[PDB]
Amino acid sequence: MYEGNNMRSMMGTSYEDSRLNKRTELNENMSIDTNKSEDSYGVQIHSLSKQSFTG
C-alpha cells in the first residue's frame, strides 16, 4: 500500500516472488513411465541401447 520506494536492494524486493526457477519436477516419471510392468507380449529381445551419460 505504502510506496516509499518499495524496491530496495534485497529483502525489500524479496517479499514478492523473487525468481521462481527450476521447480521440483517429474520430468522422469515414476509410477507411469517407470514403475511400469505393462510391457507388451512381444516377439524377441531386440536391443537395449546403452548410453554413456556424459550429461
Binding site: 507388451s40 507380449y41 512381444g42 516377439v43 531386440h46
Partner: peptide, 16 residues
C-alpha cells in the same frame, strides 16, 4: 518389435 495375438477369451466355435 512385433506383438503376437492373445486369445484371452477365444473359445473357438466352428460349424460343419
Amino acid at each position: 518389435a512385433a506383438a503376437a495375438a492373445a486369445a484371452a477369451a477365444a473359445a473357438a466355435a466352428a460349424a460343419a
